[PDB]
Design a protein around this ligand. Sequence first.
Ligand code: TPP
Ligand code: TPP
Ligand code: CL
Ligand code: CL
Ligand code: CL
Ligand code: CL
Ligand code: CL
Ligand code: CL
Ligand code: CL
Ligand code: MN
Ligand code: MN
Lengths: 556, 556
Amino acid sequence: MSVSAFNRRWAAVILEALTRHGVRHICIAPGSRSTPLTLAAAENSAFIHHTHFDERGLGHLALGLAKVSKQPVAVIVTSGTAVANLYPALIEAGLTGEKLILLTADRPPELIDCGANQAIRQPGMFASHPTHSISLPRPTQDIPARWLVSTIDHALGTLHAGGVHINCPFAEPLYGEMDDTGLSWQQRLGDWWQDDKPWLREAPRLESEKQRDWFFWRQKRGVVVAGRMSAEEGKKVALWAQTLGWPLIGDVLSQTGQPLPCADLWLGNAKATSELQQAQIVVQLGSSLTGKRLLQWQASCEPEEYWIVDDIEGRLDPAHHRGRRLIANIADWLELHPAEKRQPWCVEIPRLAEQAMQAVIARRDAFGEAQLAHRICDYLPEQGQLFVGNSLVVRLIDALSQLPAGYPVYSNRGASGIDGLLSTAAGVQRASGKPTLAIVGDLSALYDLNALALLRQVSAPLVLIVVNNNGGQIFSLLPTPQSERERFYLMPQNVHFEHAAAMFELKYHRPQNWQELETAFADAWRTPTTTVIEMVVNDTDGAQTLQQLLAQVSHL
Amino acid sequence: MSVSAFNRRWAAVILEALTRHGVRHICIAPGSRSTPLTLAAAENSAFIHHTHFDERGLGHLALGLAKVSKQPVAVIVTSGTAVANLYPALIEAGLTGEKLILLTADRPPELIDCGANQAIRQPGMFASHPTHSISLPRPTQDIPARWLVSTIDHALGTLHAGGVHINCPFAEPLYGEMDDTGLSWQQRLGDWWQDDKPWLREAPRLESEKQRDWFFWRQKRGVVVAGRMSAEEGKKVALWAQTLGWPLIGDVLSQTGQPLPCADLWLGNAKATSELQQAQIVVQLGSSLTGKRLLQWQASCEPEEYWIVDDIEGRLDPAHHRGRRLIANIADWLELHPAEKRQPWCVEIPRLAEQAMQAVIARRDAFGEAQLAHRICDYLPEQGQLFVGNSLVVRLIDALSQLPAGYPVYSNRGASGIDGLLSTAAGVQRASGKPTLAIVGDLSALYDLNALALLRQVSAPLVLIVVNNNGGQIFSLLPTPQSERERFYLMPQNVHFEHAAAMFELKYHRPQNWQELETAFADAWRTPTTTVIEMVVNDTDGAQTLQQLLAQVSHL
Ligand SMILES: Cc1ncc(C[n+]2csc(CCOP(=O)(O)OP(=O)(O)O)c2C)c(N)n1
Ligand SMILES: Cc1ncc(C[n+]2csc(CCOP(=O)(O)OP(=O)(O)O)c2C)c(N)n1
Ligand SMILES: [Cl-]
Ligand SMILES: [Cl-]
Ligand SMILES: [Cl-]
Ligand SMILES: [Cl-]
Ligand SMILES: [Cl-]
Ligand SMILES: [Cl-]
Ligand SMILES: [Cl-]
Ligand SMILES: [Mn+2]
Ligand SMILES: [Mn+2]
């Protein structure tokens, strides 16, 4: 008889099913309509439970979790605009591949389009952005549990990457006594409840075949571009490229070690671009390439074929080159297409890359964001991970430093949003347990401000560098019109973060030089908490230093 | 020739066209892709420009503006998750009628699903939540300006209520000199550029017909239920119900003056409900009724007829009574269905309503949220406006105080989200220019924390009361389960707002008695600046006081 009790039994099947697909982490926002989902999750000891009050934050927390653990991470939210806040993190997931299982509570069909409070049209509301969309029916004992677990099984079994959105109508009485309504119904699943596999096993592998002409292509004048990939993938790619004798352009996100550093600088030099005109094939592994000069070279170069090896799906070359798009695990792929010993063919690029770095070393003293980015390894935590925020920071680290091979870097570099960086960071460190360094801009920090709440619960030191250049200074770098740049572009907020840290009880440091920055780090890494280091810098110095260094290099 | 210059030409046609439909406020977030729209907006002298860095807050700021002004308000954002953030405000607008014109910038078609940075598929991404979706084509001179303005003219001309999503591909060379490409193409529109009406006027009106059996019905035992309507409509409805001799159950949002106050209390009393069983007809004006007892009585009652009169569309009875759904401006409808002076048929309800308010007044003294709610009248600015947050506050002011007839009230009571209350308040005050009192919960305040940024800029004094009962205390009033309530429901963040206030250079108080609250307000209505008043209150007291007042009143 009890609707209250049955809703929970319905929800218990949902959650148990996700358990069979490697879902450990679950992110929960407060609600009433979500009561069946939340209580089922709460009482299921397979989960590690995370909670937060801002649903946009909640999505990004889940996104950081899935980013690092490579596992499907679940999200429970209540009906209404709560669901709509998951949209940004879902979008990023859909572009970078994080498996997010969004379980969104709903009013039941009777309470739709009739002025019911906090009742909206939720089925379909993320359009094409989920990989799978399940819109569950009203819960009824007339639909057997086997269908409910099968539906979920298929969605998860076949999920290569990106998000699944499972809309969960519940009618209400939501609370009440657990009388054993639906226990019978649940029992038709038999000992599946004691099993560790899913009910229906459906896991087709999606993968491109061996390139049988690889033995031919591996001998051409090639170039290796390396975008976003795993830390270990980064090392493998470096040795591979080296063996071929092909120049490797490694992104900040590559973790290759960057044997030809300051690509964003040297690629702007005619000697480099014309040397590369000799490249017969370009093999790019991973994507989301950072620098302007890399994108621009890429968009303009004309090899015989262009390859992109990556674990995600769909076309990845925005310049649409003739070539191949190869779906694979990068490490697997490298083993399936091993490098072969060849003499290098580049003469000028190794030279320019060295000079480029030197021009930057020559500028390392000024206490500016350009320099912080140059010097950033100095500050990497031992056995840690770097989280790079968006806008100027990622561009400057990519252009001016040479990150160590196999040192973990993480970013939200799919949609490049500045909406969820702090909570994504929270996820990232939570996932792995590692000491974590996260560097972010001032608007970025202002955007995801309340995420500082999550930053009270960290398992290893997290250092949050907020670079404060009073506004979105990237729009200084781009050729924006002078007269409406302050108001409509930069949007300085004229604020500091001392009071932010105070509010949430985090250590704060506002260093005036390098000696003070190192002493802030020394204290920070001592304790499994989050320290906020505000780096206040002159608004336009970073962008100008980049432009100058670009110009300098382009004359060498 | 110049794509740059034409992007801007195209955009200015769009923005100019909005001009002819009373769009005067415009809300801009920072970005590169949105350049054509933003620059066109900036140079167009019709618009009052508003800016913010958080796009979710931006949407809600526009919601605020559109709410008060009852004009269409435009929003510009850039491509990527920026767009996705408009969702919450858009869902709200869709339910309550605010006219939000979302001009969302987008990459051109060549750059979608090809690994291009910050490119996602936007056309259709709000599903069916917009009233119209204009998905614009790639800008070209081969499509006449008369098409562009006409498409915008149609969507805006026909717009009864809710948002229009206008997606705007712009191909890049976004910056460049402003040569005279597409001037010739603009001129094909002739002297329309000096006109003040639309190019295509298509403005059909949507109305219900005169109810020609009204003279029959107005003599039966009727009940007037009044929900969200304008402040002038509240006064009229009070005059009307009084004349007919029908009891008026009036919501916080109604501005009717509430002449049977504390309905949430007296509707729980059996004598009141049985007297209401004699109701032959129920005429509700407006919608989104607040309280449980009203929502519950409304659900259960069985009058021969049930009428809902509101200028929004669709069904508004979540109990789906046999009756009438009349789409009309309330002020107009009342004139078209005038009252006739008649002897009030209710006997005990007035007595119960008085005794209920007395029960409440007898409890005014304790320094807590329930008591703040009850006496909020005392703090209302002269010639000002109220903005009520969600959760416990709106429930408490509806239950425990009697707001003045005609004194303007506003809320986000469609989807009842807690995600945009401060930024909505901002736009609410900005639209009217009136001194504003806005009260909100702690988690509410945290959710929209960065909106404190906008509150630095206020055309009249704004007081923001933040009730801090350490968590979502509504889940203390709802019969949620014991051992998982704090963690999965209330989610206390153990925090204050002194520092938040400080960060954003806003005056802060934290009164500890009625006197200290009076001193906080002495200063608060003089200067056109924002004052934060944090009300620290025992977590659980509000909920229990309501519960007790409920129990006390049912015994009358
Ligand atoms: C959600 C979202 N909105 C807007 C943008 C456009 N955008 C890119 S960078 C930027 C400004 C970043 O400001 P800040 O954190 O101060 O970084 P800085 O420009 O100084 O590197 C904006 C608004 C975006 N990427 N994501
Ligand atoms: C965007 C959104 N997420 C979640 C909810 C569900 N919800 C309704 S009330 C509430 C708690 C509000 O807490 P607070 O601001 O402290 O007010 P209090 O409960 O103490 O009145 C929540 C989470 C919602 N309405 N909107
Ligand atoms: Cl809820
Ligand atoms: Cl159904
Ligand atoms: Cl960026
Ligand atoms: Cl700390
Ligand atoms: Cl942009
Ligand atoms: Cl609410
Ligand atoms: Cl100042
Ligand atoms: Mn900045
Ligand atoms: Mn609260």
